[model samples]
Target: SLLIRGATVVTHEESYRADVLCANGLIQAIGENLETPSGCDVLDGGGQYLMPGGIDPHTHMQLPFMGTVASEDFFSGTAAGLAGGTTSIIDFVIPNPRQSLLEAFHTWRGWAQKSAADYGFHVAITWWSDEVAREMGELVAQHGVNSFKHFMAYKNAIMAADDTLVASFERCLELGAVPTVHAENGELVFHLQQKLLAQGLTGPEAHPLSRPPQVEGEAASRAIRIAETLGTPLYLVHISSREALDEIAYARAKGQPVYGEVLAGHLLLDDSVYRHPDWATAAGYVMSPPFRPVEHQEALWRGLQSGNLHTTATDHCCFCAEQKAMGRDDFSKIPNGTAGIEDRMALLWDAGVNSGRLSMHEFVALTSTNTAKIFNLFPRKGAIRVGADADLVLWDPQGSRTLSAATHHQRVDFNIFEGRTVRGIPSHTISQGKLLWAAGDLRAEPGAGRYVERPAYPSVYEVLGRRAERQRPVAVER
Candidate 1:
């Protein structure tokens, strides 16, 4: 048994000074001045904040892209996640060309079997023939992967046509699975990019200019229409525009089941970073749905606070500065991502809570609770309560630190958030009642992570409603 005392406990409902008792990897009790039995380990939580460990729903480690690979793999990536107070992560499993969905799942499993922390996978559905659609049911019911991801960009390589996307969404609806879409118009952006480059506008700034906000808005509106028509739930991933938010808001107003997500980069950096000292800085900032203008940051912050955005994720895909050199002459060849798994909690704390843009409760909801609920990892991985998994963070709100690649644990060679300082930092991270990271060091190993099978959608109550009791017979003698 372990007792964490003398700290302010922040749960989903409220926050108060209390001691949390844990045994058998579950929270036993939470109260003031609790008694500790002999042989129990006592952890001093003074001047600290106790909250549920963070959950990053989107990340890409050891990903093969553009004839190369992502910098961080399973062990290194999860290590960074742990140092930042995140205990769980959901990464993508992209299928190779001509690969079947089941084959892809197996391949991703081989990669994730060595993970150090808890993990889940979102299978990328690149090809949507009738045969592939039929396989959706087995994937959800038997394989325990209840969600599918489809792309709206990537042009002829991976983008799905409108007809194929609608077919996949309908299939997911029937199987009780949610369909997540990367909403962006590839054809339109390609055309704009060609025109801009022909006019000699070839710098990194040209990237965002070519793929403007209207492209994302149009694609999101179209996706929402398809899901609404079929009565299916849709999640818009990596949404970075005010126009895109407007589309989701309008869809929800009409009673459509739609969700929106934004990345840490979009919430923090803007287009101004593209004009940094050297071309390398600009190249590093390049990504899909490129950074928005500075004026757009205020609107995104408001969107998060007002429930317009459902969750915030890291999208933590790393490529070193040398790897970014692949596009030195042509910005189009640059890899699209930034290293963020280790810095998400600190950045959110500084910008959202300390700056007064959001309350502490809202911060937890955006970073942990809502993510777990949307991704189907709820109750088990996102809360501090009885019967919940013992995933917790001991954070020091007054501990100040500067961000730099010199001290980061990720296996990458550069830091996108370098030189930024923040106030809050995680002192210890516990996963399944075991300390995985403490005082800036990792105490866990790869393959320590357990595979989690998610529950069905809408939950048992939401699907069955109050009449669920009618199916159960009364225990009266007959």
Candidate 2:
């Protein structure tokens, strides 16, 4: 129900000048000097770049984890992402061990009903059982869930054993679902935590020490191998180190269907934050696969440029200062998360496109298109073609903003990109053909967003079915 004039429409493949008309929650037309419809809102794009809104494939909204719940719930989190040019998110639905998968999926669906932007879920496989296997089929066949996430870390909590990984991955291949992993060796992490604590290295400074790149590298390698053996596609989330990237590179070189996702915070921030003199400041940076040394940042950039990493995400789980203070004497006790849902798009634009490391087309792919394709949201959510969802961001390359917690919309008190000035920002955000944000003004309401159902890939099921038929054992007549 809106018309944007005189903007350069950028897609994953190309860019061109056009007037985009959106109506009925879909892109209705794209042409030169399109006629405005009755009762439609019109805006001057000011020669900005109009692109598909960003889709963050990895976010944890209102997640209860590690003895605390994330500060930003679904409504506030999606609104915050909308303010940053993101129109959709693939949040995790993590069930407790031995809990029913459908039970947790519905619980998250209920929680996400208040979201201000379209969202989807990637249900986690926290434990393994025949019931879990049966429910995985039901989720994909009946409920439109397309991806299953497995955590290799968080030992004794949500960590999946080798047995669990094998069973779940085989099921995923049979069911036409992609399996994703949080690649970190929980045993190494747990051992290092105990060793560090026993040695009296209990401060936030020891957080990174307890979980180094090797921990992630080992687990990434393990998962890739497992996926290769099972002949199923694998997605590694929140890849934060050169070590893990190397493993990804190795797998892709071997022709394995392995995809890697890099977080915006990991690309910009480094491990030095863990050594800050202020305890609270250091504690705030305590996520797993904890930010690496400065040298790894450029390597990650190259990984993106070289096409080794396919998507960019924020991991947008938030924990407030008070919640972070829980580990004042023990870094292990601190809730492990940081806030960046409101800064990811601008930060990536400034650091990637403006710096010439990435083209605008590539930016669209990394931020939106690739994720859509990977998670099975595709042309419906990440394209500007007719009939695609009218979720768009009018980006002003020259626009500038200083990011801070005080001004951001996420329901958290700390900003990981605090005080960082980014030159590119979203001038307007449109979702479902509605003007959700304009020139610093926001007009969004709870329950405005809808659940995006991602169907399992038809090709996966067809190919696997044929492969099974082809590999069928021939009966020998006696």
Candidate 3:
């Protein structure tokens, strides 16, 4: 049991000065001047902000792409997430080309069992055959994976064609699962890449130019049209341009169930970094739907502030300078993805709240609440209310710290935001009522993370319409 008092409690709907009491891994009560139990531990919040822990729904710890692997594995990734005040992460699970969906689930399960904090997975569907589509229903109906992620990039490898993407989306609509997509046109980018490379533009600067903003916007518009025709909910992942934002906004205007997610790196960094004197610096920032021009950064910030963007995630796949330099001579050979799991929360709080781009509530909503709601983990993992998981962060808004590879908890060799500093820091993080990290150190043991069973979509209706009673737990094979 524990009592956190003398703090400003920021709940989903309200903020006030109160004490929070926890017992048996649940928030028991919240009130002003509350008394602690006889044997309860007490933490002096000292007027700091106490809010629910962050939830990063898009992370790629140990993910495989091309011929290289992501730098951080589950243990290191979750540790970094905890250090950043995030208690929960939803990682991607890609199915092997010859493996069954169930095999992929078990493979991810084996990896997640060793994680340092609570976790979930979003199954990736690369092949949209009738058998695969049929299996998706069973997977969602019995495995608690209520979301499927498809890619419009990767072209010849794992990217799904338009027909395949639509088929998967339709299956998800029927199975009551949400369809999330990586909205970038790989085919179009391939053509542009050949033209750029032929013109001797083969360095890292050619990355963004090859995969232009129009590719992303066009893919987003096509995805929206497909979802509209099929009457399904669609989520655009890693949206980075005003063109993509406009398409999403237009879809929403027509009452389409469209949601947008933008990564912290895209919101913070621009393509000018690619022109650095060090070519490795340029390679380090390579990611799919590559970094956009400086003008797009302001547009992305505005989109986030104006509610056009629904959530903020890290896309936290780690690839250090050494690893990224594997393709130093060829921009296309560089491993995509940069490490930011450890710095996402701090960066967002500093720029969003400190810089006046977003209020405290909006910050919380973007980083945590909205993510949980979209991924069907709300009320269980995103809020600070009673009966919800005791996943909370004790933030020191005045704390100042510099980010570097030496200070970061992630196992990656370099920090993508090495020289960046932030005003707010997580003094403590609690996962399921357990003190996982505190005082700038990790306290949780390995394999402490539990597999969370996510509920179906339309979470509000499921809760308010009393449909939860009829829902059964999905049995996932490990």
Candidate 4:
């Protein structure tokens, strides 16, 4: 049992002072004064904001990609995220062509058995077949998945062809699940890469050139139009450019249920990282849908402010220095990923909330509340109300921390946001009523986390489908 007092309670909608109590892994009560039961511990939340723990809707822990596996496994990655106030993650379960979605899901479940924070999976549709469509049903009905992912940009390996995209989106509609995409034109990227290599432009400087903003814009527009035609909701992940944001805005204006997720690295860093003088330093920033020009960052922030974008995530896939060496001779061979799970909340707080771009409530929504609602975790994972799970962060607005790989807890050796000091730190992090992170001390337990199951067909889709029907093309009188 635990009691937190003297803190102002901050939810996605409002803030007020309150003393909150937790027991049996749920919030038991909230009020001005509560009689502390004997044996219940009291955590003085003096001078802090008590808010919902963050829910990162996108991450790839222990993922095997591009001939190399990510360095951060489930346990280490979840532990690191906990220290940063993110208590939950929706990681991807990517199955290869001809691979069974259920088989891949079971394998990922085995890999995530060691996670230290609560987690869920978003199964990817890499190829389409009768069996694949059938398995998607099994995943949603029995395996507790509410979303299916499609890679529009990997080309030949995991990319979904147009046929597969339509088939999978149709399946998602039939099963009442949302379809998400990593928007980028794969053929364009492949052709661009060959041209760059042929021109002897194989250095990291060629990384951004191969997949410019237009590539993502084309894919985003295509995905939105496809979803619009099928009347299914769409989610675009890791949106990095104004081009993509414009597509999302257009879809939303037409009242399409399209959602966009922005990553912390994209919001803070620019394409300049690819031009670093050091070869390894430059290669380390080579994630797909490469970082865009500085102008796009403001566009992204405005999108968030204007509600065109709904959530934030850290596609937290990490590759250390040695792992990035695979592309020393060719930038195309570099593993496309980066690490920011441990710094996402702090970076957003400093650059977003402190800079006056986002209010505290809006920050809560972008970081946790919106994600929970989208992924169907809601009060159980993203609210501080009584009867909700006691997952929360005691945020000290006055506190500060300098981010560095040498002192970070993530398994990776490189920190993307290195040497940057950010205000607003999570003074304490609680998950399931357990204090896993306190001050600088981390007490995470392996396998303590449980898998969260999201039910298929959220209520929001009903309204969305109804609205889409309002504009349904009418038949001419016979």
Q: Which numbered prediction scores highest in TM-score against the true structure?
A: 4
Ranking by TM-score: 4, 2, 3, 1
Query: Could you tell me which residue pairs clash in candidate 3?
Result: none
Residue-by-residue lDDT tens digits, candidate 4, 1-478: 9999999999999999999999998999999988898899889998999999999889999889877999999999999999999998999999989999999999999999998988999999988899999999999999899999999987878899789999999999889898999999999999999999999999999999999999999999999999988878899999999999999999899878889999988898899999999998888788987888999999999999999999999989999888899888999999889888888899999999999999999999999998888777787878989899888999999998999989999899888888999999999999888999999999999998989999888776788678768978898998
TM-score of 4: 0.98
Compared with the true structure, what per-residue lDDT tens digits does model 3 show for residues 306-354? 7889888888888877778877767888888877777888899998889
Q: Candidate 2's residue-wise lDDT over 1-478, tens digit each? A: 8999999999999999999999999999999999989988898996699999999998999999877899999999999889999999999999999999999999999999999999998999999999999999999998889999999998989899899999999999878899999999999999999999999998999999999998999999999999987878899999998999999999999767789998888999999999999988888888877999998899899999999999989888889889999898899999998887778889999999999999999999999999988877789988999999999999998999999888989898888788999998998999999989898998888999999989897344565566667877899999
Stretches of candidate 3 off by over 4 Å are 459-478
Task: Tell me the spans in candidate 1 whose CA falls farther than 4 Å from its real position.
Answer: 460-478
How close to the true structure is residue 66 of candidate 3, measured as C-alpha lDDT? Answer: 56
TM agreement with the true structure for every prediction: 0.93, 0.97, 0.94, 0.98
Q: lDDT per residue, candidate 1, 125-188, as tens digits? A: 8887766776667778777787889888888788877998888887876776778998889899
lDDT for every model? 0.82, 0.91, 0.83, 0.92
Candidate 4 yields a Cα-based lDDT of: 0.92
**TM-score, prediction 2:** 0.97
